[PDB]
Design an enzyme around this catalytic site. Structure first.
Site, short mmCIF file in Angstrom:
data_model
loop_
_atom_site.label_atom_id
_atom_site.label_comp_id
_atom_site.label_asym_id
_atom_site.label_seq_id
_atom_site.Cartn_x
_atom_site.Cartn_y
_atom_site.Cartn_z
N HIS A 157 0.79 -1.20 0.00
CA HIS A 157 0.00 0.00 0.00
C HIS A 157 0.83 1.26 0.00
O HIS A 157 0.30 2.30 -0.36
CB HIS A 157 -0.94 0.02 1.21
CG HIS A 157 -2.13 0.99 1.03
ND1 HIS A 157 -2.36 1.91 0.08
CD2 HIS A 157 -3.21 1.06 1.88
CE1 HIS A 157 -3.50 2.51 0.31
NE2 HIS A 157 -4.00 1.99 1.39
N1 LIG Z 1 -3.75 9.99 4.88
C1 LIG Z 1 -2.69 9.20 4.97
O1 LIG Z 1 -1.57 9.71 4.90
C2 LIG Z 1 -2.80 7.70 5.21
C3 LIG Z 1 -4.23 7.15 5.33
C4 LIG Z 1 -4.24 5.71 5.87
C5 LIG Z 1 -5.56 5.05 6.30
C6 LIG Z 1 -6.54 4.40 5.33
S1 LIG Z 1 -7.25 5.53 4.10
C7 LIG Z 1 -5.94 3.22 4.56
C8 LIG Z 1 -7.01 2.62 3.64
S2 LIG Z 1 -6.51 1.04 2.88
#
Ligand SMILES: NC(=O)CCCC[C@@H](S)CCS
Ligand SMILES: NC(=O)CCCC[C@@H](S)CCS
Ligand SMILES: NC(=O)CCCC[C@@H](S)CCS
EC number: 2.3.1.12
Lengths: 243, 243, 243
Positions: free
Chosen positions: C216
């Protein structure tokens, strides 16, 4: 944590280096920080949205008059706000002493917008107090500002929960990552027509896939099966929010 | 591992601090210790329990005479005990030298009970030697003692495998966490009537969702697809345990 | 990361110590190194392979003449090679500065073979350039050499992506582990006949389960829902690769 060995990738063929925006870099760092702090579990459930859909589509007139477009995100947001109040451990965070949870008495909810520069998750405040067209309007404002790099850090703060909807692209389910210090995130994927047993025969019902990931240190397995159960019940008859 | 930054949560609204029982604290610590030590994979499978169900329900007389209530947990426990003996790597633990597995020649299995004070996982010893009504009786004793904080540490020890059943609350599947030093945990969610292709047409069959998480350092992808396959086969015709 | 406490397992019954091959040991170490470096998400999707199947089976003559056996793995490999070129972030790796991605201009793909000594993942180079019977032939050579410990380290290198197929054993879906420094791995489980809504009634269609895990930090939620969407589209009509 041991690192991954570097590989001379160019031994195998032609490579090219493109670099990451600082937004990607940030995003990358926060995800990994969540991954290592939160022991993650995902609970899957499907909700019958056949009637919710038919409603969505009948209020198209009203929404067009009001200048908004009513998608499933306002309906998702209203129902999660109602449930974040019924089941409060979902609306809380683990105090840094590791010995307490800070229950938040407010309901602001963030939602994931994937922009070219990276992922942004604008927050709608006091979801519990706004109506479907209010939330539809706002969701849309925040999303355009997000795409236009005109969203300001103010608006990316102090959310309680996140909804990440990939339904518009496709997929059957996924395992999203808790956006720590929040304790749960709801993933929504693509609705399909599905045979559902009515005690005698199978009826086609429009089914919405829900994938709730949670911080297992704060939410146990049954609390979470109960949250996705209540949510599939609310989405099947959203009038229960009136009760 | 980097920590999560503290947030003054009260900037966004009213908060309240409620504290965690030491049981939660323990639970929280052990889960995170598993999460970081075990590279986790979850294998999903559905078993046809239409005949198992009909049997469960016909022996309701016998079970009521015997004072127990026969749920699916004794049937799950008997079949997993049989399989933990067929496929022994599931009944083992990784020796701390990282270079050996300790194969356990016993089959004691724990099961998750969610109590108000937190999660407890009482162990039934020698599952391989007891009968469906024996296990039904015992499962129930341990669970009441667990809810009543009258379960003693003796009974929370040296299990080989865990069954975590949320079937009574709902949900389609989940990804449970290996309860290290064990190497696998079976999650069971809610049964649904489902169309199943019989070579010519779709028949409704009652389907039980199974979600087996495992320690991928000890169990490889195929060993695990084979365990859930055999288990769905055993639950479809439990008479194969007689063989 | 805190360790797991040692348990005298022999307090509970008879134990036996069997040791791990160095191949297991290696495998164990690399998996754990991936687990802690990659924040993992799995995207699930089902593809309609009813026509692909019927094609597979009609070219059985041609494949038997050619000495190969055409399974679904060459069809999976050709379609992923085409997509690794359409959507290049899937064909890349995170540069160790954490600030860049190295886009690879080559497409070599590895595939998991589970052998008695452990897991091996032979790589087919330039998948994009070979035909279904070429890849069928090669897949098979590499797999036999792998089982025969006659596969040499040369052939376990510089892959871009991995396919892990448990379809031949069973299961509904799983969450595979990214084989870092690669950024995604496609898990394929067992095909089933399934009712699929054709706008008016449900038709039985042969459905292949796909479970794409990704890093991710490099791939966002929508990029991945789009990869599994395109792949289910390609597998439904593989002629689109001609386009
Ligand atoms: N806003 C960020 O920097 C990271 C967000 C991480 C959390 C969720 S959206 C992951 C979804 S798979
Ligand atoms: N007894 C504990 O303290 C933790 C149990 C962790 C393992 C399983 S039950 C997690 C299921 S999601
Ligand atoms: N070859 C190895 O030593 C480890 C491979 C790890 C990546 C994939 S195959 C995991 C699949 S669940």
């Amino acid at each position: 944590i041991p690192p991954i060995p570097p590989v001379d990738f160019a031994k195998y063929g032609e490579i090219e280096e493109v670099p990451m925006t600082r937004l990607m870099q940030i995003g990358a760092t926060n995800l990994h920080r969540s991954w290592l702090n939160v022991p993650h579990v995902t609970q899957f459930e499907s909700a019958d949205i056949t009637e919710l859909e038919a409603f969505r589509v009948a209020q198209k007139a009203v929404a067009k008059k009001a200048g908004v477009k009513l998608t499933v995100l306002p309906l998702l947001l209203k129902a999660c706000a109602y449930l974040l109040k019924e089941l409060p451990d979902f609306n809380s965070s683990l105090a840094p002493s590791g010995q307490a949870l800070i229950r938040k008495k407010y309901v602001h909810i963030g939602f994931a917008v994937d922009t070219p520069d990276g992922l942004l998750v604008p927050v709608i405040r006091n979801v519990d107090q706004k109506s479907l067209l209010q939330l539809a309007a706002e969701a849309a404002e925040l999303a355009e500002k997000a795409r236009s790099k005109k969203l300001g850090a103010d608006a990316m703060q102090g959310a309680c929960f996140t909804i990440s909807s990939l339904g518009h692209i496709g997929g059957t389910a996924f395992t999203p990552i808790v956006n720590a210090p929040e304790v749960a995130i709801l993933g929504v994927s693509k609705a399909s027509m599905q045979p559902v047993w009515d005690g005698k025969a199978f009826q086609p019902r429009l089914m919405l896939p829900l994938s709730l990931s949670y911080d297992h240190r704060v939410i146990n397995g049954a609390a979470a099966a109960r949250f996705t159960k209540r949510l599939g019940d609310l989405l099947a008859d959203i009038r229960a929010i009136l009760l």
